[PDB]
Model the fold of this input.
Amino acid sequence: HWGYGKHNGPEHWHKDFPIAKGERQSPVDIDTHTAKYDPSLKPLSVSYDQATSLRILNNGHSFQVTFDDSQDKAVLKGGPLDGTYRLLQFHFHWGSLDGQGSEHTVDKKKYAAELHLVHWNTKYGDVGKAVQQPDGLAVLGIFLKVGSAKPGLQKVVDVLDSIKTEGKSADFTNFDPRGLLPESLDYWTYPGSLTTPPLAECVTWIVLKEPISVSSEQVLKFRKLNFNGEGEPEELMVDNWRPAQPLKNRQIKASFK
Ligand SMILES: [Zn+2]
Done:
């Protein structure tokens, strides 16, 4: 099975998922001087007030918080998007040290972690159908740097003890994802892919320019999770990030000058 180790990591994934060498793979380096300000880009609309979180789960490659996506409760609209995208889950990528962990980079700079809020286009009816469409998903990416604590993250951090190993889940209701967002919704956008297998090329990426700050104690909690299941040799869930992929025939657009 795929993972992030020497023998099953990102350099291996193309064997089971040949699209790994495709024309619109993610993540990418965001060269801030080459990204073009697009005045026609609209402001992002993040409507999370009615979000209904359900569970938190260790899926063996990250931990994710899942939401009720059976109605338009928490949706992403506007920005570069046509139509309405429902929030399904969020998860993180992080490092073993504070100088690595993000998937996207900014002028080659790596952040300590990266939050992905995953939304799917409601015109395709279900997320399984959406991942087979070039505009099926919209992922909101938010960088994490280490500094001051993020109060809105603490509820997540405090439950990680209970989902240490692959396959464990817990109730995680009434979690408000608005508490994870930075002040500014200024963003970069480009067409890409899932950054985990099956690496489907169905994602409009929206990467916020402003990172959030989390504390060292908070990120330390991430690094105590485990890739392995209960009872197997302990392998810390760290460095669960895919490196930057070739930009190829793509332009990154900026909503801001
Ligand atoms: Zn991700």
In short: The domain at 1-257 is CATH 3.10.200.10 (Carbonic Anhydrase II). The chain has four helices and 15 strands.
